[PDB]
Amino acid sequence: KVFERCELARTLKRLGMDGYRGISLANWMCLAKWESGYNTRATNYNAGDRSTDYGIFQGNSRYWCNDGKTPGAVNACHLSCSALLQDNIADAVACAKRVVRDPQGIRAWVAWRNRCQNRDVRQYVQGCGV
User: Fold this and answer.
1) Buried b / exposed e across 89-122, counting CB within 10 Å, b at 16+?
2) Which one of 15, 41, 62, 125 is least enclosed by Cβ atoms within 10 Å?
């Protein structure tokens, strides 16, 4: 499923993402935008290390979810990577909350540093009623 901006914003707020571990809703929106373009079936194979990124937040198979073909993989979210490909993003959101419980927080995603950090991110939630 490809979410429309405000639709996703309201969905994330209902799932308790606003302010989760100090992270504003606009930051979560900026992250999903650059990670998958708000596309729940987005997948990306990393030829260099044999891992694959899955879903709206691009959860990696080496650390976060299990796909069975990634060497030395841990499954910190205790989820099959298939779970991060559903139209219902409850599981993808639960795994993203898990990622930020680590010390790096939102910085765990390099894309956030490149495209969101120290910028005006209000635009991601403007007019959404959240």
Assistant:
1) bebbbebbebbbeeeeebebbeebeeebeeeebe
2) 41
| Per-residue DSSP letter, 27 | H
Method: X-ray
C-alpha neighbours within 13 Å on the C-beta side of residue 38: 14
Whether 24 and 117 have beta carbons less than 8 Å apart is answered as: no
Q: What is the CATH number of the domain that holds 74?
A: 1.10.530.10
Helix (H, G, I), strand (E, B) or coil at 59: strand
Task: DSSP for 72-97, please give it.
Answer: T---TT--BGGGGGSSS-HHHHHHHH
**Number of domains within the chain:** 1
Q: How far from 85 is each of 19, 44, 126, CA to CA, in Å?
A: 25, 12, 27
Query: DSSP 3-state assignment of 110?
Result: helix
Catalytic center residues: 35, 53
